[PDB]
Design an enzyme around this catalytic site. Structure first.
Site, PDB file in Angstrom:
ATOM      1  N   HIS A 189      -9.948  -1.862  13.215  1.00 39.07           N
ATOM      2  CA  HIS A 189      -8.759  -2.618  12.851  1.00 39.07           C
ATOM      3  C   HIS A 189      -8.379  -3.503  14.039  1.00 39.07           C
ATOM      4  CE1 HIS A 189      -4.264  -2.535  11.520  1.00 39.07           C
ATOM      5  NE2 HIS A 189      -4.892  -3.579  11.012  1.00 39.07           N
ATOM      6  N   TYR A 220      -1.409  -5.056  -6.002  1.00 40.33           N
ATOM      7  CA  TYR A 220      -0.943  -5.614  -4.732  1.00 40.33           C
ATOM      8  C   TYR A 220      -1.913  -5.416  -3.568  1.00 40.33           C
ATOM      9  CZ  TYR A 220       2.396  -7.461  -1.418  1.00 40.33           C
ATOM     10  OH  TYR A 220       3.032  -8.254  -0.495  1.00 40.33           O
ATOM     11  N   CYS A 268       2.769  -8.240  13.070  1.00 41.09           N
ATOM     12  CA  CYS A 268       2.641  -9.575  13.669  1.00 41.09           C
ATOM     13  C   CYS A 268       1.810  -9.618  14.962  1.00 41.09           C
ATOM     14  CB  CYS A 268       4.035 -10.155  13.940  1.00 41.09           C
ATOM     15  SG  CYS A 268       5.106  -9.077  14.924  1.00 41.09           S
ATOM     16  N   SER A 293       1.467  -2.879  15.244  1.00 36.90           N
ATOM     17  CA  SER A 293       2.455  -3.751  14.580  1.00 36.90           C
ATOM     18  C   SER A 293       1.801  -4.798  13.669  1.00 36.90           C
ATOM     19  CB  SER A 293       3.360  -4.443  15.612  1.00 36.90           C
ATOM     20  OG  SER A 293       2.627  -5.327  16.447  1.00 36.90           O
ATOM     21  N   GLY A 304       3.044 -17.354  24.351  1.00 32.26           N
ATOM     22  CA  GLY A 304       1.979 -18.058  25.065  1.00 32.26           C
ATOM     23  C   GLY A 304       1.758 -17.609  26.503  1.00 32.26           C
ATOM     24  N   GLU A 305       2.763 -16.962  27.099  1.00 30.38           N
ATOM     25  CA  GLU A 305       2.665 -16.459  28.477  1.00 30.38           C
ATOM     26  C   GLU A 305       1.720 -15.255  28.614  1.00 30.38           C
ATOM     27  OE1 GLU A 305       3.956 -18.667  30.313  1.00 30.38           O
ATOM     28  OE2 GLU A 305       5.318 -19.517  28.820  1.00 30.38           O
ATOM     29  N   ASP A 347      -7.660  -9.366  11.941  1.00 32.72           N
ATOM     30  CA  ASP A 347      -7.436  -8.057  11.311  1.00 32.72           C
ATOM     31  C   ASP A 347      -8.589  -7.066  11.449  1.00 32.72           C
ATOM     32  OD1 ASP A 347      -5.534  -6.411   9.840  1.00 32.72           O
ATOM     33  OD2 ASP A 347      -6.888  -6.575   8.134  1.00 32.72           O
ATOM     34  N   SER A 353       5.962  -9.211   2.297  1.00 33.48           N
ATOM     35  CA  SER A 353       5.491 -10.403   1.584  1.00 33.48           C
ATOM     36  C   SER A 353       4.364 -11.055   2.378  1.00 33.48           C
ATOM     37  CB  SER A 353       6.633 -11.390   1.330  1.00 33.48           C
ATOM     38  OG  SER A 353       7.317 -11.726   2.516  1.00 33.48           O
ATOM     39  N   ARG A 354       3.536 -11.840   1.695  1.00 31.15           N
ATOM     40  CA  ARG A 354       2.229 -12.233   2.228  1.00 31.15           C
ATOM     41  C   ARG A 354       1.879 -13.695   1.993  1.00 31.15           C
ATOM     42  NH1 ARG A 354      -0.782  -7.906   5.110  1.00 31.15           N
ATOM     43  NH2 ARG A 354       0.516  -6.096   4.550  1.00 31.15           N
ATOM     44  N   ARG A 376       0.851  -1.185   0.000  1.00 32.76           N
ATOM     45  CA  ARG A 376       0.000   0.000   0.000  1.00 32.76           C
ATOM     46  C   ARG A 376       0.890   1.239   0.000  1.00 32.76           C
ATOM     47  NH1 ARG A 376      -1.758   1.133   4.337  1.00 32.76           N
ATOM     48  NH2 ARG A 376      -1.115  -0.591   5.709  1.00 32.76           N
ATOM     49  N   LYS A 435      -8.973  -3.399   2.985  1.00 37.24           N
ATOM     50  CA  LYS A 435      -8.812  -2.099   3.655  1.00 37.24           C
ATOM     51  C   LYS A 435      -9.769  -1.039   3.140  1.00 37.24           C
ATOM     52  CE  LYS A 435      -5.409  -3.470   6.216  1.00 37.24           C
ATOM     53  NZ  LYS A 435      -5.699  -3.686   7.653  1.00 37.24           N
TER      54      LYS A 435
HETATM   55 MN   LIG Z   1      -4.172  -5.040   9.157  1.00 36.49          MN
END
Ligand SMILES: [Mn+2]
Ligand SMILES: [Mn+2]
Ligand code: NA
Length: 592
Positions: free
Chosen positions: A255, A226, A279, A277, A501-502, A302, A392-393, A78, A235
């Site tokens: 979001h 893309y 991830c 972020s 996981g914590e 998302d 990359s996706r 984007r 989006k």
């Molecule tokens: Mn997103």
């Protein structure tokens, strides 16, 4: 009349307004053929095979029905400077800042766009098929779902939209004569090609433009094939257009991930969460909790569309049908549920290809078997510059997620009892705190950073952020609305907390606080966990003093910078209640 050019479906069978839309842009763009998508498996497979024949994608022989696309290096993400919203008044789209440029959106006048539109779209699909994609954002026939029609000249978009939305003949039947969002896309390379084609990926970077016209219910995108520029459901529809619809109609388009959490007794609660972020959301939404007996399940990672029902419950659906996750950092160790999801029926874009027909990227955390050489996203050999492009996706069905929530397609939605705002802060901000009130909670969302990113929505606001804040605050005056408890989390204080996981330990505390346990201590910034409130069994000796520490000097500076930001960027449209919470927090910190 374009009936002679129809190669699948029929213009006659379409609803009149859908025919108007298809035939009108057919006259403008001048495609060779018109393909009304049915969404079937036969259509999908033969389209992938056609992209394979033309060098657009490559089959990944290690996995079951997985594919790899490598793009022009100029079209990889984007582009915010070419992403615009069109309204009569600039003020309705973004607040007028006291100084400089707005960070909260980019406006373009109706007149400016008209010129840009006419300099791009006339004849843009020459010698190409126009694919008509009828798609539903949300479970088919849900009261919260919204339908759209995407016109595109890219088979890659069709394939990707099949995964990321519910699309096909069933959506046209469910639509009927009702309203829909008009989505128009072109790669902007009519045949014969004026420009040379790089890596078999058609695009026009010079004329790239992603436009939104909320008053006309239109998304119009040109020049990029893309992700967020071409998959107009993701989006453009689900955040930018949807948030404006949500303002008008009394709901929220956000979001946010949606996850379901279950205690050892089987009691279930649903949480929503916004992180800036890449991830951060998928880590939390697809988490393996380390606490005995606790379960975590993903509704989505998302987008969340949330509305108050008649009983006052904030009901959420995931309007997407798949995951368009960032590939780098997706680890076999620290994200096993995401890796399992992508082992079949997944389209990869700009990742590295191994010699044995697999995929590779930075942070995968799995060493390659002896002999296995890597081809990078530029189609060259690579030896441990990155092998995969950072944006990359993977594009993968949501149904294949091993911990997909059994209510992820429920039309009524899931009851959101908590909303979590997130930020990566090295100093000052504790592991977790809870907002004193709804109003303070809205202020917490507005004060997020890790550039400042309020509600994780900075690039996605569909209208004035000041009015967006006012819309959020107005939920407190809805009759009998049960307002979710609001929290802020920071996993990355220093690292004093293991995470992964914590973080389930932090979610237990949120769960218990929602039930009404007195497991909280009051502080100037909000409620924090008590001494011994968290479950720390198995962690050793974690530094809970410094982790939940509140420095007077840090928070004095923090509120000053928030004040300057909101004054500068929201300015005259900053609601009184946010300016009240700011001064109230400033006052609590002054008394430390
Ligand atoms: Mn997103
Ligand atoms: Mn051909
Ligand atoms: Na290619």
């Amino acid at each position: 009349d374009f009936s002679a050019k129809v190669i699948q479906g029929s213009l006659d069978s379409l609803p009149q307004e859908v025919r108007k839309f298809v035939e009108g842009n057919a006259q403008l763009c001048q495609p060779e053929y018109i393909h009304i998508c049915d969404g079937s498996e036969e259509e999908y497979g033969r389209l992938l095979a056609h992209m394979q024949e033309e060098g657009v994608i490559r089959k990944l022989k290690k996995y079951d029905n997985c594919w790899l696309a490598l793009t022009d290096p100029r079209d990889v993400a984007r582009i915010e400077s070419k992403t615009v919203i069109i309204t009569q008044e600039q003020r309705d789209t973004v607040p007028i800042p006291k100084s400089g440029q707005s960070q909260l959106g980019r406006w373009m006048s109706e007149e400016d766009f008209e010129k840009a539109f006419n300099a791009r779209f006339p004849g843009c699909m020459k010698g190409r098929t126009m694919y008509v994609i009828p798609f539903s954002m949300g479970p088919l026939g849900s009261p919260l779902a919204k339908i759209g029609i995407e016109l595109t000249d890219s088979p890659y978009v069709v394939a990707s939209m099949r995964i990321m939305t519910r699309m096909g003949t069933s959506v046209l039947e469910a639509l009927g004569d009702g309203e829909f969002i008009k989505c128009l896309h072109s790669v902007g390379c009519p045949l014969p090609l004026k420009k040379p084609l790089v890596n078999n990926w058609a695009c026009n970077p010079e004329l790239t433009l992603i436009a939104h016209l909320p008053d006309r219910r239109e998304i119009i995108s040109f020049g990029s094939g893309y992700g967020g520029n071409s998959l107009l459901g993701k989006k453009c529809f689900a955040l930018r257009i949807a948030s404006r619809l949500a303002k008008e109609e009394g709901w929220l388009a956000e979001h946010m991930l949606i996850l379901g959490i279950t205690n050892p007794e089987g009691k279930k609660k649903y949480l929503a969460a916004a992180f800036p972020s890449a991830c951060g959301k998928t880590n939390l939404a697809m988490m393996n909790p380390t606490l005995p007996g606790w379960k975590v399940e993903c509704v989505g990672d998302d987008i969340a569309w949330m509305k108050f029902d008649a009983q006052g419950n904030l009901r959420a659906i995931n309007p997407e049908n798949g995951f368009f996750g960032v590939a780098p950092g997706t680890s076999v160790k620290t994200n096993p549920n995401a890796i399992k999801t992508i082992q079949k029926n997944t389209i990869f874009t700009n990742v590295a290809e191994t010699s044995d027909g697999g995929v590779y990227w930075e942070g995968i955390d799995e060493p390659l078997a002896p002999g296995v050489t890597i081809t990078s996203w530029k189609n060259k050999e690579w030896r441990p510059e990155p092998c995969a492009h950072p944006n990359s996706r993977f594009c993968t069905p949501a149904s294949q997620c091993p911990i997909i929530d059994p209510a992820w397609e429920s039309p009524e939605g899931v009851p959101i009892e908590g909303i979590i705002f997130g930020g990566r802060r090295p100093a000052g901000v504790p592991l977790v705190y809870e907002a004193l009130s709804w109003q303070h909670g809205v202020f917490v969302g507005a004060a997020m950073r890790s550039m400042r990113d309020p509600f994780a929505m900075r690039p996605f606001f569909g209208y004035n952020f000041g009015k967006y804040l006012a819309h959020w605050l107005s939920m407190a005056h809805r009759p009998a609305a049960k307002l979710p408890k609001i929290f802020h989390v920071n996993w990355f204080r220093k690292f004093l907390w293991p995470g992964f996981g914590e973080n389930s330990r932090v979610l237990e505390w949120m769960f218990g606080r929602i039930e009404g346990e007195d497991s909280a201590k009051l502080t100037p910034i909000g409620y924090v966990p008590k001494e011994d409130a968290l479950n720390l069994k198995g962690l050793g000796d974690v530094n809970v003093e410094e982790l939940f520490g509140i420095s007077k000097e840090f928070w004095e500076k923090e509120v000053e910078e928030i004040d300057k930001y909101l004054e500068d960027q929201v300015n005259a449209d900053l609601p009184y209640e946010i300016e009240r919470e700011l001064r109230a927090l400033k006052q609590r910190i002054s008394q430390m």
